[PDB]
Design a protein around this ligand. Sequence first.
Ligand code: HEM
Ligand SMILES: [Zn+2]
Length: 180
Amino acid sequence: MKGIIFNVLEDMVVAQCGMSVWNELLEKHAPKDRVYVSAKSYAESELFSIVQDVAQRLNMPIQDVVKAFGQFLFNGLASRHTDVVDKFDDFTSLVMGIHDVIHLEVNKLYHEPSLPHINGQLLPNNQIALRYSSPRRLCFCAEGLLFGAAQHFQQKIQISHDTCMHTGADHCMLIIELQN
Ligand code: HEM
Ligand SMILES: [Zn+2]
């Protein structure tokens, strides 16, 4: 888990709960004197432990917190990597470009990143079928990021997530319908 993800999480937690809460979370869940360097890889367990704590504090499902973070995360990534996002003229182009374009540019900018397996099909009814697979099981973060990307492009969307790893499947299937 690259530090940039933790950095955007910090922005969210600090903005919503204050720096003392963020530092408390780091004391509880990260090694002593932890500082998240954007380019460096960290144990994904640190991220999950932090988000698990937040979710339990709010008495919410962890996956709803993860989805909220995902939506927040798109702007966090877009802001830090504007050149990458600027490559896309619309929502559909971005989503269909996750596999080819995003994956490439991240591997160019980061040392040994851990990216999900994402594959998109544009269907003749102009729905997008997005397959997700990852050991991290962060499909709800993916769902959140898609909504974030939709907001960015001023595009309204609906997502059906009727196959999911969290129920035992070896992948998730996110059907994205663009609406008016
Ligand atoms: C709708 C658009 C996107 C989706 C669905 C998506 C999906 C994801 C997900 C779900 C993760 C969590 C890791 C995992 O699941 O294994 C991730 C990680 C990541 N994504 Fe994306 N992403 C999107 C856009 C972007 C963009 C625009 C960038 C720009 C650079 C980006 C760069 C990254 C980076 C740097 C990581 C962390 C990799 C690591 O921790 O090693 N993503 N992505
Ligand atoms: Zn899923």
